[PDB]
């Protein structure tokens, strides 16, 4: 804090703090307004967002509606739930995104009742398509894609989660030009490539691109893939069979009791310092006036 820099009383008195979630670089309100706000003649029917976020290698997929008192989660699905369904490593890949997508698609569809109806696309050839409404019967569940502060590049994994919720059955309106294998110049899409990315083909092809020109970083990157004796030829079925596992049971059961909460409350209030008394710091400065002004 250079002496030439410190801030004046006036500066701070007249400074207007932004919204907490903006100071925390976490909410784009200019986007939130336009995602959340509903047509005023639709009065209480809420706008549902499919938020998807990326921890440093773990995928979050919530479906939220908003509320004057605070956003309420209808369904939640985390990509770290993928062990259950038969994936073990890299739950940040494009196909882990697609997986979580599908997972929450069917989790909410069943939570609602359009489980049997709107089963989505199953034979996933990687086509461009949206879960269409069914003649003489309920329209699909509609959510809009909350990618947050993600920077919308063509071929990114936020749109993989997109593709997987869509393929699961949710109606998530979307274009195609930011799906991997969208052609930059000529306005068409390669579905063999998009099916590949849905399954692993770029990670599998990285594996058997490194198993015979670098065993020396294949060694460490992909370590687990050797430690469980599974190579490129594999994956496409690891994932197809996860797909089966999810469409067969989406039901979210949670984690086992494991020192139920009051216990954690205790063993963390051990590390939570609580504030001092006004009389405490009164004396803690009368100490200092004795000790310093008092000619030692």
């Amino acid at each position: 804090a250079f002496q030439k820099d410190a801030k004046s009383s006036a500066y701070s008195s007249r400074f207007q703090t932004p919204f907490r979630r903006r100071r925390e670089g976490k909410t784009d309100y200019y986007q939130r307004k336009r995602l959340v706000t509903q047509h005023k003649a639709k009065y209480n029917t809420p706008k549902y967002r499919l938020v998807v976020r990326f921890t440093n290698k773990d995928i979050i997929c919530q479906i939220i509606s908003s509320t004057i008192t605070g956003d309420v989660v209808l369904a939640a699905a985390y990509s770290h739930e993928l062990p259950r369904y038969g994936i073990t490593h890299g739950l940040t890949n494009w196909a882990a995104a697609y997986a979580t997508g599908l997972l929450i698609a069917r989790r909410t569809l069943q939570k609602l009742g359009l489980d049997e109806t709107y089963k989505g696309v199953e034979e996933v050839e990687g086509e461009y398509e949206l879960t269409e409404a069914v003649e003489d019967g309920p329209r699909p569940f509609k959510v809009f894609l909350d990618i947050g502060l993600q920077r919308t590049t063509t071929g990114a994994r936020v749109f993989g989660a997109l593709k997987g919720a869509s393929d699961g059955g949710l109606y998530v309106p979307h274009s195609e030009n930011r799906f991997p294998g969208w052609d930059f110049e000529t306005e068409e899409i390669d579905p063999e490539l998009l099916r590949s990315y849905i399954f692993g083909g770029h990670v599998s092809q990285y594996m058997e691109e490194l198993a015979d020109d670098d065993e020396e970083r294949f060694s460490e990157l992909f370590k687990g893939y050797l430690a469980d004796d599974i190579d490129a030829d594999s994956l496409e079925d690891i994932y197809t069979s996860a797909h089966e596992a999810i469409r067969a049971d989406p039901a979210f059961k949670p984690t086992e009791k494991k020192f139920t909460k009051e216990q954690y409350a205790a063993e963390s209030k051990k590390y939570r310092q609580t504030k001092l008394s006004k009389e405490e710091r009164a004396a803690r400065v009368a100490a200092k006036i004795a000790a310093l002004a008092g000619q030692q």
Binding site: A1, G25, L149, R151
Partner: protein, 169 residues
Amino acid sequence: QNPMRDLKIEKLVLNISVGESGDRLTRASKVLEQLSGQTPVQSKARYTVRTFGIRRNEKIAVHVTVRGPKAEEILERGLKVKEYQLRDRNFSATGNFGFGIDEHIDLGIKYDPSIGIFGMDFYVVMNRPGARVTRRKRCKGTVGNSHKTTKEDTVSWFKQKYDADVLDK
């Protein structure tokens, strides 16, 4: 207390301020390019003076940003020129440092009298790990005092490497 408070170099940026446009500039740029391997960037004039004979938006300079090992390389290739001797000036109180060298052939690259000779500003901006808070999109934050570059801390890092000398006062 450094477990990783370990002062990398963030970037080095080289800069010929070719005080007018045209051939001399498209030459200083190819100079920057067979020293950088990257395509350099031209800088337009901000405003117009006519002492320095320039015009707003006149494309009167060129620079290039090089990061990592290649930039240690061209750094050293220039500390040779300046004999591993620097000044207690030349250092930002914010931690970075730079020097200048006319006669850009002292860097290796040969003479080729269909490009001429050019001078160059060298600026080395330095940073510890986790400079990403300041420069990422989400959760953009400021690094703690203890953790950012100092002048003193970076002259000490500079003397300790290269066995170089800095200055009087």
